Each structure stands twice: as structure tokens, then as C-alpha cells.
Amino acid sequence: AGEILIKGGKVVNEDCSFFSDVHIRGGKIVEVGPDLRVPPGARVIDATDRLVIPGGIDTHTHMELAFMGTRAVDDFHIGTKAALAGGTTMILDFVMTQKGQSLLEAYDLWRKTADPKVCCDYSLHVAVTWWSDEVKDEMRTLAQERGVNSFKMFMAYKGLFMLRDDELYAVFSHCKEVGAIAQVHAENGDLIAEGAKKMLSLGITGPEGHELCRPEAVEAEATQRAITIASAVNCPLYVVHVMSKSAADVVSKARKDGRVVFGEPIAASLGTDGTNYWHKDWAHAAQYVMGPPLRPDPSTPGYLMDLLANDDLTLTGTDNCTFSRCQKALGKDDFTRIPNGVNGVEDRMSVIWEKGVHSGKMDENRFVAVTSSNAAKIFNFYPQKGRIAKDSDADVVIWDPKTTRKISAQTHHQAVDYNIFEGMECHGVPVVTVSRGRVVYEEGRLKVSPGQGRFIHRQPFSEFVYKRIRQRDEVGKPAVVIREP
Amino acid sequence: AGEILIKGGKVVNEDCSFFSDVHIRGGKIVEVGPDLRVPPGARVIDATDRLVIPGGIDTHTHMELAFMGTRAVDDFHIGTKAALAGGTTMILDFVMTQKGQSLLEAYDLWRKTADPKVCCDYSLHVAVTWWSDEVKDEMRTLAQERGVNSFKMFMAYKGLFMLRDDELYAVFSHCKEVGAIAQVHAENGDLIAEGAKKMLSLGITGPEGHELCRPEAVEAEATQRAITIASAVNCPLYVVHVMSKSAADVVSKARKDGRVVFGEPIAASLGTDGTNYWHKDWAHAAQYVMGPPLRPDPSTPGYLMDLLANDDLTLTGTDNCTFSRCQKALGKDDFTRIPNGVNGVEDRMSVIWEKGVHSGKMDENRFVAVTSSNAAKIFNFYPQKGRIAKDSDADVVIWDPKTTRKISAQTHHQAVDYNIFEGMECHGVPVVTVSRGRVVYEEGRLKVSPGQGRFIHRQPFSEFVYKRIRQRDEVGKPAVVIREP
Amino acid sequence: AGEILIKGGKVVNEDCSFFSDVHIRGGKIVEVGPDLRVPPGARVIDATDRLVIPGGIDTHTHMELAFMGTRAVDDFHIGTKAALAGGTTMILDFVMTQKGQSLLEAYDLWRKTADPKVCCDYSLHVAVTWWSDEVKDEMRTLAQERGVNSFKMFMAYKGLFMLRDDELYAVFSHCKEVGAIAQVHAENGDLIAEGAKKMLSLGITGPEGHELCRPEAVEAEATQRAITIASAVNCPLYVVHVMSKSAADVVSKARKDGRVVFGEPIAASLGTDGTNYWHKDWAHAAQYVMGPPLRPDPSTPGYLMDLLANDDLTLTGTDNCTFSRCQKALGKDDFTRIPNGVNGVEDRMSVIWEKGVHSGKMDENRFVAVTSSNAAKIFNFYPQKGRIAKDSDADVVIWDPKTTRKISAQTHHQAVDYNIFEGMECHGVPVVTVSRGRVVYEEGRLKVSPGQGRFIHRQPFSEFVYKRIRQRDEVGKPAVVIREP
Amino acid sequence: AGEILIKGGKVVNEDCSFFSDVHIRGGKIVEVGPDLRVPPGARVIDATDRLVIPGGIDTHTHMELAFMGTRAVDDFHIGTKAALAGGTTMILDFVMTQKGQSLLEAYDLWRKTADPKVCCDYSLHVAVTWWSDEVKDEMRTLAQERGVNSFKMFMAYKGLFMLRDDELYAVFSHCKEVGAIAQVHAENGDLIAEGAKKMLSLGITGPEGHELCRPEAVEAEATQRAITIASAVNCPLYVVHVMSKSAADVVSKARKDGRVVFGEPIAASLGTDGTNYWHKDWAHAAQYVMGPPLRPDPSTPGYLMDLLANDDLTLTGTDNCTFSRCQKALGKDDFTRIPNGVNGVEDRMSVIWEKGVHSGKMDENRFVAVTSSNAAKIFNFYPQKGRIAKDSDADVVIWDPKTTRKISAQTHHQAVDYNIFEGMECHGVPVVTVSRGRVVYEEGRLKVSPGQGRFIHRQPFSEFVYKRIRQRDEVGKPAVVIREP
Numbered sequence A, B, C, D: 001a002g003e004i005l006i007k008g009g010k011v012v013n014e015d016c017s018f019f020s021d022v023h024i025r026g027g028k029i030v031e032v033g034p035d036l037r038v039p040p041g042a043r044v045i046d047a048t049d050r051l052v053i054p055g056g057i058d059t060h061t062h063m064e065l066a067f068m069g070t071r072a073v074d075d076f077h078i079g080t081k082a083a084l085a086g087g088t089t090m091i092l093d094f095v096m097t098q099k100g101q102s103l104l105e106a107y108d109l110w111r112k113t114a115d116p117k118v119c120c121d122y123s124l125h126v127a128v129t130w131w132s133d134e135v136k137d138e139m140r141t142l143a144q145e146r147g148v149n150s151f152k153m154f155m156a157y158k159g160l161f162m163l164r165d166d167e168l169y170a171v172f173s174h175c176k177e178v179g180a181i182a183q184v185h186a187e188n189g190d191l192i193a194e195g196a197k198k199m200l201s202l203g204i205t206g207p208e209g210h211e212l213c214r215p216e217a218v219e220a221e222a223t224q225r226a227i228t229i230a231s232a233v234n235c236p237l238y239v240v241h242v243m244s245k246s247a248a249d250v251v252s253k254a255r256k257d258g259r260v261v262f263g264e265p266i267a268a269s270l271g272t273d274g275t276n277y278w279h280k281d282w283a284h285a286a287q288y289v290m291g292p293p294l295r296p297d298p299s300t301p302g303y304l305m306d307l308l309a310n311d312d313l314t315l316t317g318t319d320n321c322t323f324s325r326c327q328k329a330l331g332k333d334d335f336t337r338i339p340n341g342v343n344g345v346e347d348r349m350s351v352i353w354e355k356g357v358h359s360g361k362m363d364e365n366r367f368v369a370v371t372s373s374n375a376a377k378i379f380n381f382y383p384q385k386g387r388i389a390k391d392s393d394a395d396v397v398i399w400d401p402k403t404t405r406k407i408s409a410q411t412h413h414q415a416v417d418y419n420i421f422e423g424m425e426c427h428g429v430p431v432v433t434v435s436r437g438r439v440v441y442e443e444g445r446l447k448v449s450p451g452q453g454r455f456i457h458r459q460p461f462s463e464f465v466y467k468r469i470r471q472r473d474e475v476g477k478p479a480v481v482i483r484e485p
């Protein structure tokens, strides 16, 4: 069996917190309540003075992605181990289909790579990086049979992944038809391409050139544009890696205006800023390079945390896409060649707790919402995950909100040899991680086998995403004026 | 016993909706799950094609209030009956303590009046309409022993209930000390007093004078002021009856800015507008008169519903404070003498469903949040109410979202002889109402006895309200700069 | 000679108003001051109780444009006559170069058509409707030798005039190089194309389909996008025909943010709204059809006037592009075939005075700014026009602000057989119009000859437009961080 | 006579810039034009490579004010000398009438003190620090006979100058009746009083306590409140010393909304920030203390300059109210006793040029608007001052925009022994200052006699301020609905 009783702790769900024990049997939570009996043989995890929360769900990872010449060093095995050590029990990774390549082939290739390696549960989003009848069919198959209800489109990466407004319109229309959510990388790829060309011609080859060629206006513009096209076809939209105040404000305004759109800041944009691109040490600066870039306005991470607290922004991922110091160095003379991507999978939970809960910006319940529950709602497996309740999956973290840990590449479990949060002292430590009903992390040690985690198959038409869309299809149809001919 | 099994319906909570039966025994929900056994003797309510939702909680009523010369016609008995017929199973009414009068006496007087009459559960807020050592002591007693964690302060009603900024500061400080929430009637009472004097001198004695003397700037101003004072003392704030776009925007901005404040639109401001004050029929116009007034900008109710959907605004009441046609007529020659107050207790649920869910602005789950769950969270009895779950109170409504009912003073159960929503066709009908585990409304008929309802005693420091306040007390203390003398 | 002395009136300039006579000799104002001597032979125009203002400058006309199959009925001759009768003494018309056609040929063709016909002064903007080395050269020639410092680009009209973001970037870059201002028609042409296709498939063929296929989000999106690209290249930008609140707000925000951008509402969007597209009479509805469309939110024209008063919006034109009732009827069965364009050249001045000055939104001086002075500043001939002062051109209107005139296609001087402002009672009447130092309109009668007006040759680098751009070129250059290799 | 010909320079007015000489005779500009003849005897000031601009007008000074126990060290003599040396040729100083004291007596006392000492022209605003029939009469006399059209009211300084909302309403009403503009010190005096009491009890006695007791919310709140009351009585309003982003945004929103209100940032809030209150050196920190305080958000001065460039904010003063290092030291142990006030009169022009024009935020013409022209328009002597034109007063500065000067208490002409802009390198130097047609400053040396300057008597109903107010009185009267009784 493996029975666990988590005793003495305070359960924290998105709605409220309460003292109760949690009885885990066979991969599931089978009872939640005060003073539960320890069945003979069951292991007791003593959660006295700890919070018992749903494991974190990272909506946004790229484990071992082949990108910009080289492949990310955190792979599905190490990446999921590092996740677990940081209190994160599921990741959602992007199938980065190449232009002209079958989405089903790319999906198959990702499942073959990840299935034997993941140490925690996971699922996949599929990038739609070109358009045709075939992609159209494949999206339906993915949504109805392969357990994927999220497709990722790019407005940046000109020549590589970018789609133009007419194609986004079509793609978004078909997302709505198959009951998928549309995710977008929202930056203006034409401005980025011109921008970088210009920074290089001016001899600005360092990482400050990377930020200067695509300042936050370029992100805010494409964010509004994506929302507008999606609003025109009544397709639900998800803006991945919101990095800037102005893009966050676009999302905030559109939601207030009743648009079905969700904004996802990431640990990087919540925990540090882009002043690091101006560091005198080139290696240090390059560590932070990713698209969109972190912003040189120091008030950014605090502001994004305030909007995350208030639900202008709704949930978090990390965009974990790591490259070692010697891989980043590929762009020593030209920032367009630094492989883009930062760490976060392991530290997300502590970073958000320290910058969001300890700071007084959000409460512990909103913390659960924005680290697991909302991901489960949008991507369609709530309350199977994201809630401590009978019948839910036993993905559970015992959390110490009072003790601190200092984040350091010297003690972290990620494969990357630096950490963008190097030195940060965070309140909020994952003391014990349970995944699929097994203790996989405790006393600073991991106990898990590659392949122990499972792919989570999801159904389309997630209710949290589609119930308003469908009611608007029914009452928001345009009408003709009846006239004499 | 009275056992009820509600079978075949779809349960709708704030987080998600799911098919399940609900077993009610002894005033409580004792089981929720699929295909439950009907125990011998238990009555089955067939909820096939219906939603099974928590009963509505009206945060804002004034049943039989003696006000402006006369007393409201809907009393605790008829008012709670009408509530039940409209799908609302709890009301929170205001103890309107007079200036210089003991808050404990006023509280006692309200409990004596309401206890033998209420047909559904209820609780009370207490108005703090003057300030002194005695009021200070009485507030502590109310909060610690009398089950009241909400105190109501007025920035309008000059000469009558109004408090100045220094007194609000003190009052708000002491609310924070006793773990109460501060509610405010946010209009500038000095502008209202000057405004009305001016409208009368210009011979504008009709109800249009009532709105013109205190247009929405006057509400927005006092709303910002209340938020600022409350932010200065770190006291949680609740703005009652938000009537206008601009005041709603103040609340929306303050929350985005991380201020602990909640905004409560009411059915009136969600379901109609203030163009009615300009109606050629004086009686018709006077029906809508209340403070703050409904606004002549027709886009108002739709905008307030959009902000309620997005959580800029968080929950709803009705400010039910009804006066018959012949009572309103007291101000035939002078709008300052029309007793202020409109209906809503009965129609709130259908009005919000039609204007909010049927319109596609919010989903059924957000509907439960803004009609019961959030009230229970703020006023500190969740999930005892506001949730369909084992151990919760059996206050449950079987709801038909597809059928319409037309609202009319001819068919309504309120004592008042008109209805501000006269003629409105609403999708969303309460077909069966269960209160304290008894069927009190079914087949258009009420079956309930005055006194059947119970006063709900609450504890202070509601966690949903105070967890951020307390963390800010711990990390947001101002520090001195250490200097050589 | 033709000497005129305008006596007894109050001169109104953009900065202030003052009593003075104005002495006109040889096409120029040669003296302004109190109690001027009447030289023997000079005609006195008695301006007692009248304002003496600079003639209106219409920044935005399409006289006799061949468009959507047919050509506008108001031609350079009738159009300029109608302008004069309405108090407007200069128009700036768009050379609508076709895709692949020489801009110089189109320019020559417009000068040949207009020179022998105009009855008042005029100048030209040139549309850049495709991109290449040749267009690049021609733009330089136009700017340096042909008196044109304004080029017009389209984000709408897919297949016809539309340019993509990379081309706008290049085009805007070259505008900056030649010291021109970039004008943009800011709507998303991909959304319009999809939108219309969809409205037709739903059998919405009436004019309401025209507005519904491109609601204001589509305008606001492209407006932000244009501003962003122009900000990226430091090119000054001008947004023509701002029709909606949301697009106006984009412009307002960008200016507050220090972006060099100007917004131009037109008489149509200041004086009426798009509810007319829903009129039961098809002919009536089609009268209002133009791109972007007038908006069905009735608060629009008032809001645009408030932003024009506050300088969020800076100056006005009419987009005068008129088609008779039988020409509009070309789209009786399909709104995509209604020739787009409304009237305004004649009524602009009275419409803006009535809706802006008489309403109390702006003063008479701001009225001069937004009807002549700012056009002269941006398009680079101030104070030669747009000011009553010694040495300025004698384009002068004697204006009665107190008397009303009702606008009617029955009394107007435009060739079109209807008027979108039909029935409007406007305070503010042009009683006498002086153009090039000659009385061309008085006692309701026109006295002017086709060809009397002159083309105004302008120089590039208008100081009002470029002084900030050039200082930013000097201090806003991006810098490299100096690092060890 | 004293004739001066200023030759070879570029004249810069609010509307445009142009090459011309300026002929000065007898205190007036008597001709402006190219290549003017030098009359025998006239002194030529060679303005080759210089701008010739209207002298600066400082709307906001307190020369030798007795305040908080002691009197400001810059008096009318030294203060006006320092003004002249900085390119400022007029100051408007506040008659600080004490509570219960005759406004006419205070006015007389200020004229007696200033008349024999001023070295440049000046005028006065009168503070209305209490309310009664007598103050009412005195305000009329001041406005009609004493040349004052601006009255200053306080929402801060509880116990000392503060007025409550009902009194502001009355005061603002009477300002409108006498054709005066209402100026307000907009901070919530009740919050300040509580705030400071709290900071002291926590042992925060340093200048950081001064800012922390009244953060920018306290300013923004009172700013909105003042605007609302003034909007209710249709009285034009002027918000003095706007110090914070949020208060500036209130003003910006109200103007966009068509409210007649003007915002005046000062040199301090445009040129430095409130991080200085946290300096380890107490003397340094105390130098910056004034009400409202400078703000610790470093983006503030840049943001205020952007809103000044865009006309959200309209004109500038300095609030010059200086106290020596040993006078500031009066509050060594208690920040409530540091005499409030900073320097600026001398450096305003260079500070604004460097931070506003050199930075690319505004052009030279907007610079003239916000340093002289708008003050002259609002306070009612334009174009007698604020314009280089025939008949205007010869208050003229020859300005070098290319050379820098470093500001230092070691080289400045103010009496105060420190400078809040210490060390700042500003482009933009006043090389020659002409006041009343005499060279009073050249080659770094002053040549002027105490009493040479004149008091400027103004008339009420300034047109720039009142033309919209009066039109709204005529068309914005509320109407009754006509009903059967």
C-alpha cells in the first residue's frame, strides 16, 4: 500500500485553512479530518507547526529543450527532482514543434523523452508554430485523444515560430472549436528583429543590448494585440511569462473589461529584475537573458506580485530553460547568440512565499491558488490536483513558513551552475514533499526514481475557462436590423 | 429528524461545479456524493436539471428600520419570508444606533425585535454613529461576546450619523484592535448638505434633485478618503452600497494597489439606474430614491456587474429598506423628505443571475462567490455557510437557471407595494429553498414560522480579512535611521 | 490693392483674445491694433459683436477621390467653396497613391486637378501605400522640393493600402530621416477583413455590419501598435480620424508618457455617433459609413470633445469624402460595397463651436488652436496661418458666437444630397470669410473663382514636431556597458 | 531713457521661436524684428547664440516668512536678487494671514515689507485661513481694489490654517463670486496630525519620520477632495506644490474630465527626491523637509516633469521658504519642529531646463509656457509679462542653453547656507537678466537696488481661468422635471 498519515499540521487550500490530519493511501488522499487514527503499518509525517498544502504546479517549463544551438541542462529527470526539492509536484512542459513539423510527432517525441525520466507528474502544452489543414487536424486529435487542452503560439521569433495576425485569428478560432486554451508568447517579433539589428550596429553586444532591443512597450503592444484578436473570435487566451508592468497592465485592463484572458508571471519576474543585464561581469549579466527580458525598472517584481495578489495576474510558472555558464558564453560577443532562458523550477515556491506572503502582499490561501489551484482549474484537473481533499491526488507538501533558506547554486538541485536568485533569503521551506502518495523529499534528501511520475491526460473545454465563452456564444450573437429592402 | 435528500442536481460551489446528491439531516449537510441512498422516511427533492447552490447571503438589510420619520414596511418576518422566496437564506442587518445612544442597547433592541420574527438565519452589523470611551468599550464587548465583527460608519448624514476624519481614524484604529471589519457609507456629507440646500433654492424639489445634489464625484471622493484613512491605520475596510462607476473605480484601484478593502454593489445598482429619478410620474421617480443615489449614466449597472465579475467588487447585498408609495409621498414637495431606500431582498438572486450569469459576465461559480461565499468569508462563518459540503449548514437553494420569471410587485412577497425591478424578465428561479435543513419554500409557496431562523454569533479576526493585515503589522513597521546625535 | 479694414471686432488667437481692428492689404494682415484709420478706398467690414479669428484649417480631406468604384461628389471646386461658406480657409488633402504607383506622379496628378479649381489655399499629404527604394527616393524629393512634410500610412485596407509592422518601421524610419511627420490610419486590417467576412456569412449586410466587423478595440489595438513602432524609431506620429474613446485613450496615455504623437478627431466623431448604423432606413444608416466607423456608444463624441479640450487630442479635420445617396446605394445588399466617407468640410467650425465652446468644454482660444493654429504648427506654416497678427496671411473669419444656424442638406453648399449633422442647431456662425485678403463669403453668398486659392509649399522638420525628437537623438542614444572581454 | 537693443538672438515665446532683435525703451519692449537699428546712446546686448526669453515668473514664494518659530533667511531683497541671478524676474508671494487676523492688515503688512526691498516685480496671493463675514468682505476688497485675484486655502496645518470641507465650500463659492482663483495646499491635516504623533511615539524623530507620517496617499486624497468641492461650486482651482505622482495623477484625471483645475509642481519636486530624508547625516536630511514632503520614489521628479511637459501640470514655482542650517537644527530631536521649507527661487530656471528641455521631455517653447506665460495667464497679466512682443514689459532673459553651470551653495546668491540641488550640473544658464527695461544681472554680477521692483496690480476674472466657468454658469444650470403636482 504505502499509507501515510500527515498529522498535526494546518491544511491550506485556496478557499480557507484549517487544522486537520490527512490520510494518504494508494496515491490518493482518502480522508481529511481532525485526529485521524494511525492504521497499523502507516508512516506518520509529523506536520506540527507546518502548513500542509497542495504541491506546486509549474505551468511553464522547457526541460532539456534543444534551442538556439544547444540543449537546456536541466532535463526531465534532474528538472523534476529539483522541482520536488522545491515543493513543486507537477510541471507542464512545452512541446516545441518546429515549423513544418507534425505536432503529433513532436508530442510523441516529448512523451518518449519524458515518460521514463519524470520523477513527478507532468503534462504538456503543444506549440502551434505554423498553420495548415494538417496542423488543424492534429490540434483536434491532440485535444480529443492526447490529453492536451493548451496550445502555444508565438508573436516573437520572426522566421522561426512567429505567426501573423491573420494566422493567429485562424489558430485562435480553431482553439475555441476544439475547447483548448490559446497561450501566447506576446512580443512584437518585427520590432525585436529590427531592434537587435540596431543594437549590434551600435556595438552594444552585451546583455544590456538584449533588453534595450525589446523594451516593455514591445511586450505590451503584442499582449494587447493578442487579447484583441482572441476577443474578436471569443477564444479564451493565456499570456505566458508576463515580465513587465505595462504588459501586466494590459492584461489587468482586459480582464476588468470582461475579456477571458489569464496572465502568468514567472518566478524570475517575481523575484529579480533586469538591472542585472547592466552588470560589469558579462557572465553574471548573461545568466538573466531570456525572452521577454527582465526589466530594468526595480519596481517591476513588486508590482507584478501586487497584481498576482489581486488576481489581475492569476497563476505562476518558471519558464525553466536552463543553460550552463559555458553554454551562455556562446553569445560572449553577440547577445543574439546567448541561449535564452533562466532557472526557477526549484525556487519558485520559496521565492513567491518570501516576496508575496511574507511581504504581506497575499495570504497563504491566495498562495495556494497562484502556485497550484488555478493551474489545475485552467488546464482541467481540479480538484484532482491543487486541493487537499478526499479523493484528490496525494501531491502534498509540508511547508515551514517561518524558517528561511538561502538560495544558492551551491546547495540547489538544478543542473545549472548558477542561480538568478543567488543569495536570496526566503521564508518558506518545503520540509517534506509527497508525490503520488510517496515521500520523495525529506531531510534535505531526495528519494525518487526516474519514471515514477505520470503524464496527466486532460479533457478539453475546461469549465473554469469555457463556461463564460459558451454563454457568450449563446447570448452575444450579432443581430441584423430588419429593414424594408 | 427531518432528513432530506436532494437528488439528481449539479452542486455549484465558489470553486467548481459537480454532479452529486446532498444528504441533509438535523440542520446540516451530512454527506455530498453521487447516488446516495434514500434513508427510510427521508424526503427526496428531485433536483434533476437544477443547480444546487448555497443559499444567498444578503450582507445589507434594514428590516423595519425607523428612519426619516416612518418605519420600513418590510419587517424581519415579511423581509425574511421574501428573502427565502427569492433564494436568500440569510440576511445581515444593521443596528442603527442613534448618536449618543449605547451600542449595546441598540444591539439588544435589534435582537429582541428580530429573534421572534426571522424566518431564516441572520446576523447583525453595528453602526458606530458617535465616539467616546464608552463606544470604545462597547465595540470590544460586541466583538468578543455578542457575535458582531463588523461596525458601520457614516461619512454622510451630517448632524445625524456623520463622523469627521479624526474620528474615523480613531474608530478605524479600534476596529483593527478588536479584529472587526470597518464598513463605511462613503459620501461627502458636507457636499450633500450644501448640495440639497442649493437644489431646493433653485426649485428642484423632485427626485432628480436628490441625485443632482450628490452626483457620483461626491461618492468617489469619500470612498478614496475612507480607504486612505483605513490604509493609514492598517484597518481592513468594507465600502457598502457602491452605486457609481467612479466609486467602483476607486475601490478597484485601491485593491490593485494592495489595500485591504472590499466593495459591495447592491441589487439596485446592479439591476437598474438613476434615469428613473427624471420620470414624469413623481411617484415612480421617488420609488428609486436612496443614498447614495442610483446614477443617470445607463452604463453604470453593466459596469458594476463587470467589476463584480472581475473581483474589483467582491460581494452583494440589497440595502433593502422599503417604504410604501404613501410613505415615499412624505416628500411630494421636497426630496429631502422622501424616506430613502429601495427593495431588493427578494429579487437579488434572480437579478444578479440574469444581469451577470445569463449575460455572460460571470460564471455560476463566481455567482455563488458573490451571493454567499464571500459574505461568509468576510463576516467569518465559512464554510459553515456559503458552501455545499459535509458539515456545513443546510441552507440550500435548488435553482433553475434556464426558466425565467418576471419580477412584479403583483407577484412578489415583499410588503412594499412597488418594485424597482418591475417588469424585469430574469433567467434564474429559486424553485426550492431549504433553510436550517427544512424546506421553507417550494411550488411558489412559503412554509415557515416567524422565529424559526437563528442569530449567527461570529468571532473577530476573520482570517480572510486579517491574515494580510497581521503579516503587515509584523513586517511593515516603520524604522528609524540610525544617526550620530 | 483690395484693402480691407475689419473694424470693431474682438481678435481671438490661440493664446488670448483682445479688441483690435485688423488692416488687410495685398493678401496679408499688415496691422493689428485699436482704432485703425480707414485708408481711402479700403472696404470696412464691421465686426462689431463678432469674433475675428484665423480661418479654419481642415487637416483631412479627400476632394473628388476615386475610391471603392466611384468618385466623391464634393470636388476641389465645390469642396473649397463649401469650406469657405463654413469658415474654413484651407484644406489639406491626401494624395492617395495606388500600390506600385509613383508618389511623384500621384502628387503631380493631384496638383493638376486642384490648382485650377481650389477657391481657398490648400496643401497635400502623400500616402505611402507600398515600400521600395523608389518610394524612399520619392519621399525625400517630396519633402525637400514639393512642399510636403506629411506622409500617410495605412494599417487597414488589406490587399489595397495596408503595410505590415516591418514595413511601417522602415517607412517611419525614413519619415524621420527626411523630417516628415508620419500619419497613420490605425485599424487592424486583418481583423477588419475577417470581421466583414464573418458579418456577411451571418447575413448581416446592413451598415450595422460595417461597425460590428471592426468595433473600437480594432482601432485601439492598431493605434497602440503604431505609437510603439514610431516610438522605437523616434519618429513623430499623427493618428488621423480618431473615432473612439478607447483609441483616444491610447493616444492620451502615450502623450502623457512623453511619446511624440498627435491625435486628430474629425467633425463626424465630434458631432454625431454610430447608433445611426442601426437606423431602420437603410439609406439613412449608409450615410454614416466610413472607416473607422462612428461608434454606437453615445458618450463617444462628448468624450472626444473633452480630450480635444484637454489636448489629449490636438487638432481637427473632417475626412470629407462625400458620396451621394445613389452612390452609397452601391452597397444596398453588402456593406463592404458602400463607398466609405462622410461630409464635414463645411460644418466643422460650427459643429465644434456648438459641441465644444457653447457646451463649456473648451474656451474660444482653444477653439482657434484646434481648428487652425495646431494644424499650422504641425504641418509647418505658423504663424503665416492660424494667427491674426501682422505679416500673417489674411485668411480671416468674422464669427458670430451667439446666433445659431441649423445645418441642413437643404441649405448647405456641399455637393452631397444629405448631411450627417442634418437638423443640428449650432451656435457659432461664419458671417464673413476672407481668403487671401479677399471677401469670398458674406451675406450668405459666395464670391470666389475656381483657382483663386494657392498650394502652400511647406518645409520639413517642423519645429513644433521635431525639436524634442532631435534633442532625444542627442541625449537618448543607448550606451554599452564597458566590460573586461 | 535707458534704451537697450538685444541683438542677434533667437526669441522664444510659448507658441514659437524666431530670430529677431528686441528693442527696449522705457521699461517696455517697443519693437521686435530682424536687424533693428541701434539708436544713438542705446546699449547693445549681443545675444548671438543665445535664446531671448521672457523672464521667469515664480508663482510660489515665502520671502522672510515668520513660520514655525523663526523667519526664512531669504528676504524680499536677497530673494529677488537671487531670483534675478537665476533668470527669474517676478515672484508671487503669499500673504500668510493668521487665523482671526484681518486679510487687509496682512496684505498691508506684506506690501510695506516688500515694496522698499524687491529688486524685481512681484505680486501677492492672500491666504484665507479662517472664515467669516469680515473675511468675505475683505476678499472682495482685495480682488476689486488691491490687485489680488488668488486666494490660498489650507487643508493641512490642523489648528493653525486648516479649513474643513464646509468652510472650503463657502470659501470656494466666494472666490468664484469675486472672480478669484482658489489655490489649495492639498494634504489631509487630520492624517498628518495623527501620523506625526504616531511616528514620534515610535521614536522616529528624524526627517524620515516627516515623510512617513504623511506619505503621498495623504496628498492625493486631499487633492481629489479639493477638486470635488471646487467642481461642485464651479470655482476654478489651483493646486500648489504638487509633490507626488499620485497627487499629480488626480490633477491629470480631473483635467481630462474637464474640471477647471491647474497643478503647480515646484523646482524641488522636479529636481530632487525624498530619499534624502533617509540620509545618515541629520543636517543633510533636514535640508529637504517641507510640506508636502518630497517622495522616496526616485521616479517621482521625472514623472512630474513628463506631466508638466504634457500639460497635466501647467506651471512652476519654488515654494522658496529658506532656513539656515542652524535654524533647521531647531528640530534636531523632533521633526515636527524642523522649520519646513526648501530653496529654489534662484535655480528653478536652470533646474527645469536641464531636467525638462535638455532631457528631451519638453521643447523650449513649453519651457517658456511653464516658467512664465501660464503664470501670467492665470494670475491675469499676459501678455504684459510672459511674452517677448511689442508693448510687453521688458522683463527679459538672455539664456545660454548649451553651457552648463554647477549649482552650489558656494556660488549661489541665496541667503541660505545649503542648496537642495547641491552639485547638480545644469545645461541652461541666465547670462543676462533685464528687469523693467534695465540690465540687473550680467557677467555673474548683480546691479540692482532694493525697491527698484514694482508690485503688479491684477484684475479679477482672468479670462484664461474664467471663460469656461462663465459659459458653464450659462448652459450647465440644473433643470426641474415638469410634473403634474
Ligand SMILES: NC(=O)NCCC(=O)O
Pocket: A062, A185, A289, A290, A291, A292, A319, A321, A340, A341, A342
Ligand atoms: N525565452 C526564454 O528565454 N525561455 C524559453 C523560450 C521562450 O519561450 O521564449
Ligand SMILES: NC(=O)NCCC(=O)O
Pocket: B062, B185, B289, B290, B291, B292, B319, B321, B340, B341, B342
Ligand atoms: N440610504 C438608503 O437609502 N438606504 C439605507 C439608509 C443608508 O444606509 O444610507
Ligand SMILES: NC(=O)NCCC(=O)O
Pocket: C062, C185, C289, C290, C291, C292, C319, C321, C340, C341, C342
Ligand atoms: N474611410 C473613409 O471612410 N474616408 C476616407 C477613406 C479613408 O481614409 O479611410
Ligand SMILES: NC(=O)NCCC(=O)O
Pocket: D062, D185, D289, D290, D291, D292, D319, D321, D340, D341, D342
Ligand atoms: N511647507 C513648506 O515647507 N513651505 C511653505 C509652507 C507651506 O505652504 O506649506
Ligand SMILES: [Zn+2]
Pocket: A185, A240, A241, A291, A292
Ligand atoms: Zn516564451
Ligand SMILES: [Zn+2]
Pocket: A060, A062, A240, A241, A319
Ligand atoms: Zn517559455
Ligand SMILES: [Zn+2]
Pocket: B185, B240, B241, B291, B292
Ligand atoms: Zn448607507
Ligand SMILES: [Zn+2]
Pocket: B060, B062, B240, B241, B319
Ligand atoms: Zn444601508
Ligand SMILES: [Zn+2]
Pocket: C185, C240, C241, C291, C292
Ligand atoms: Zn483613413
Ligand SMILES: [Zn+2]
Pocket: C060, C062, C240, C241, C319
Ligand atoms: Zn481620410
Ligand SMILES: [Zn+2]
Pocket: D185, D240, D241, D291, D292
Ligand atoms: Zn503649502
Ligand SMILES: [Zn+2]
Pocket: D060, D062, D240, D241, D319
Ligand atoms: Zn508654499
